[PDB]
Symmetry: D2
Subunit: 386 residues, 4 copies
């Protein structure tokens, strides 16, 4: 009954099930989890692997000696469980030194420190076998207009990512970068606030082939945007390197609900798209078990993430395989959308009198699109009424 296996490629951040429940108005409600027990519990639930910030695994300020001991304990748990580490990232947001950003801090010495902290963790990520390195610039931004010249900040952001790209190519590392956008919180406005802004920025880097996006369901929805549409544009550009799955109820603070919560129909269309397009990367959950929950609720919440993906996967597959849906797709002319507008070329189009001079505009306008019948078949499939 919708049981995950490591072949489903479900992954979790250490910081997700490990979130102690401290929010802007309240103290932690759960004790800290040992990264080793998180790996063990996730493996029993059917997870494929885990991800980490440097500071999740190695407490900030650790000596090189303690650092080695933390990695060895972690590596032993991975060996014992068969869990993989497909992605890693840097914490450039918790420590007070990053209060005005890491890569785009106004202070130059902070920017240099941020780069050195990142490079150190890239080495560790490669050693653990990570294939994607995520950058979430949570402190890159501003609360007021004069605090940040955004053109200069984008220069600094490009400089930082270009240097990271020079570092991985000079070391011969087989790792790629993924930028994770977020529109706001904790800064009043964050630089590169949506998937689109991040995709546009990547095209200005020196080695654009090394960089893609790591979109998160809830973050695009914090701007009221259609997440499946944004994912489709990232896939269209060949830039969907990784994805963060969770839930969000509209435009408000970043909720990080378990996947399937929040906008359920958007979750259906997302799974339909990822499975149809053959996305083969990790299905990563960046979620927070609500601070109302004890540790039993943490693992129930994590299990629910994977369960909801598998239920939606089944429903989307039944939707696409239904002959009546295939009939409805043709009635709405989805087949015609996939055909070129003018494969005959510009000159043939200009000479084609049926495209303008003799085009019956009233007859074309009278054709219904039959979209509502199609959408109700999708609803019926989602709800199990077909």
């Amino acid at each position: 009954n919708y049981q995950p296996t490591p072949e489903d490629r479900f992954t979790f951040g250490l910081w997700t099930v490990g979130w102690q429940g401290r929010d802007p108005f309240g103290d932690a409600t759960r004790r800290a989890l040992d990264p080793v027990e998180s790996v063990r519990r996730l493996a029993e639930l059917g997870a494929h692997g885990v991800t980490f910030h440097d500071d999740d695994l190695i407490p900030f300020g650790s000596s090189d000696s303690e650092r080695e001991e933390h990695v060895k304990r972690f590596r032993q748990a991975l060996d014992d469980t068969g869990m993989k580490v497909p992605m890693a990232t840097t914490n450039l947001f918790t420590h007070p030194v990053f209060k005005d950003g890491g890569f785009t801090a106004n202070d130059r010495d902070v920017r240099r420190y941020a780069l050195r902290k990142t490079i150190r963790n890239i080495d560790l990520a490669v050693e653990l076998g990570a294939e994607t390195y995520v950058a979430w610039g949570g402190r890159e931004g501003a609360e007021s207009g004069g605090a940040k010249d955004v053109r200069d900040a984008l220069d600094r952001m490009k400089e930082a990512f270009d240097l990271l790209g020079e570092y991985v190519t000079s070391q011969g590392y087989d790792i790629r970068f993924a930028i994770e956008p977020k529109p706001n919180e904790p800064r009043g406005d964050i630089l590169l606030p949506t998937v689109g802004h991040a995709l546009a920025f990547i095209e200005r880097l020196e080695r654009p082939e090394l960089y893609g996006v790591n979109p998160e369901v809830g973050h695009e929805q914090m701007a009221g945007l259609n997440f499946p549409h944004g994912i489709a544009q990232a896939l269209w550009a060949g830039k969907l390197f990784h994805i963060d799955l969770n839930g969000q109820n509209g435009i408000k603070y970043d909720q990080d609900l378990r996947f399937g919560a929040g906008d359920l129909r958007a979750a259906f269309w997302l799974v339909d798209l990822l499975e149809s397009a053959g996305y083969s990367g990790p299905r990563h959950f960046d979620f927070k078990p609500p601070r109302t929950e004890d540790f039993d609720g943490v693992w129930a919440s994590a299990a629910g993430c994977m369960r909801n993906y598998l239920i939606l996967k089944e429903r989307a597959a039944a939707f696409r395989a239904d002959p009546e849906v295939q009939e409805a797709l043709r009635a709405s002319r989805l087949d015609e959308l996939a055909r070129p507008t003018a494969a005959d070329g510009l000159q043939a189009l200009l000479d084609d009198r049926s495209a303008f001079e003799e085009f019956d505009v009233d007859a074309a306008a009278a054709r219904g699109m039959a979209f509502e019948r199609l959408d109700q078949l999708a609803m019926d499939h989602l709800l199990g009424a077909r």
Copy 2:
């Protein structure tokens, strides 16, 4: 007292002061304006020029004979007033044939018709001396998930813009295209919903140098985004070809208030940015005089657009020239943001022990950014308290 002259490059769409006041719930409250009287009245107000949709100037369905007479009347009014036409665009949204889009309609024959309708108006725009041709894909989108395969739609959108680019280069026209993003309305979700999505899409076109963005204040604010930040990224990419100025009160329907209304502080930071960066294109107002107004209120509203720009221009210039503000900018290290993070290169950075091993993280964290004092000086300048 803040009087505009044609040297200020203020322009208005015919459809702005010409809006009759029909909204989704109500009939028109004003009679239609002759395009010739709009040109005359705007010239008396100090405007530099006007813009038009094809269907604003030539009523849909006009014969070639009536078309010639409409253009000649319009050209005579331009000659009589000295008004310019710096931009033109196509109406691909009003007629029922465009109910599922123009360039990305599911029906192939509609897509071909949309291209022919656009090409015809490009010829006219060039004849009138327009330098920028704007495309607002208001019907390109969907209300439901299955109605539009977004990857196929982006293929169709790229095909359409590539064909337009082939057309202007083969004709030898000196005109460039600007895509105007909008996140929603009238479609449930519109393709290329923000400046970022449009910038990313442009980089996939065959001749990207021909295409830029035409951002609108209110449209980015309909996604809760920081409009000056988005403009800065467009300037950083070299893609700000045109701009639509107006006002918007938050995330809701597209209000198109007169410029300066809505988010007043964002308007200040926008003008500061455009003037500092030396933007030399038209200051175009895409606004709607509220349907509460008679024709006297229409011209008062249009005059207010230009007045508010000139007041904000004065205040932003006083802000940047104030020695105390220049002192505060250095106190907040805006000068350091403009300096390279690592002009010494990657290897020097890796060997620099002051960037990590010997970096005093507690001393750097204790430095205040002094952003609040800087922002209050900006407030004082905006309010005329300095």
Copy 3:
């Protein structure tokens, strides 16, 4: 298979399936429907009844003679089909005279005209057997701060509703009023913008027992509010006289999607609440078939409204009847929420040392709420995985 019957009390506005598809940017895509054919088609679909604005049934400006003929045709169709008319309302928003409002227009003569137009339709509504009279003040509001003194406007709004209440009591009519809130559109801000504001206003009227609320799914969601929570407060106050069912995708223009579209999980919790609380009024759909659709799509969209309600009704009933869910409700202490905090009284509470002096705050804090397991059971029931 989820077939509606008139016993389900599904009703539709004439203006819903009759919407011609004119939006702020486009002309109508469908021809006008005769109110008589709408009644016939809805009856065949299983609807219980219809609702109307005065101007939906009797074209504005009609003579008393034409008025009588329009009512007689309509009454004959009701007799032929068995359809009821449970609710009626006034159009105080389409005609230009209402551009600054009806009851709160700045012009006194418009306010008097608005009252007379309303009173005339109350008489007709009573004659047709309507039990609820809805008031949606779509033009009561402002785009700018100085245009409307809101305290004076609330005086005028109270005066108007008090006069309507005096009229129905003096005539001996058995009809009640329901105020329909909306936060914005077509005005920049609308007075009484949410269910809460309307409930508070009602308590200041001379005869508060005559007035309740007519909340609409999409309107509360245009403020990002939880619609089932707002309905619960209206039920708690005894003021849910009527309800408008539809769908909305977040904070944007009023979409009026078919019910079940938009926020699907909120639709589930709404149906669960209405059915558990024993709401016995009409299930009214205020929706607009998208303008992409021809007339076949209109009736498919209307049928989908009722189908989705019946599917959700089945799923919510299975959720509440599931013994495992009843167990989970007790594990989350929903039973304790229903028990008085201090039925022993204030003095016993003050003397109860187990409530403070000897309360084990750490042991209470450690109890998990088990909310995530409960919410996943709700998800499983909604998706038909149980």
Copy 4:
């Protein structure tokens, strides 16, 4: 130059300038402030008084002995400075025991504990001379639909407030309660989410005269609502007992910016309303100095709160005193809005043929409202261009 004095009645929460800068993603950037030094520094800035949560003044878990010493130190600083304490409140949100709420927690023993914790602080507030006791139910709410039966929760909320009202009347205390609404954060949805919901709830309490609202600028704007409109309705109902002043940039997390930041024009219309209506309560700032700031930035931010109020007060007064504005108000018929619609009564209205039968609807519709000229005069006054 816009200097505050204690006669301006500016007050600050201890938790405002005392905020250490811990946010959901980052550690504190400032050390804790002694409440005594906050009182001294605020007095030097011209503040009138301070407010506190119980846990701001007396650390949680303090013995009665330490409690007495904390109050005595605080009282001495008030005596030394002349600072007043006009308002106090309870922290029912930080400690883990309150993770599912205080007054509406599902666990009955937590609800009883919450009441006892509140009653203890009411005694202290009265001893310090507070006139208003604020309740912000930050944890009263839910992240999921089944976790909270909202009708039962409203019963529990009414029970709690009724008991507090019985307590203050039985003790003979001269204190009133003010409910502070917030739509979300830290809960997914918070009960009584707006001013309207809180006003409606108050009317169901046993002694409604004891309860009013404490609206906060940013909280109503988190629902996209017009804050001056909501304040006007609270004033109209006689329920504006207190107010929280700050700034917010649209629909997102609760920013608590200094007053005047965020929506500047809404701040102008708010001050215009408070001063015109003769609001005589405290001008309380509930704001957070951004965590980018050191302690010098904290006091600059607090000073900016008061400065911006005084500048806006001057501009609103000049606006209302300008003869040209008074002329424009009559041109827009604000005088007619203040006059009764039908002081002649219902029967005279029904017999008045000029209100309907002979009303010239086309002539009334043609009248412009002149709102745009009025709004530009307001803009000119705000910007100091008049």
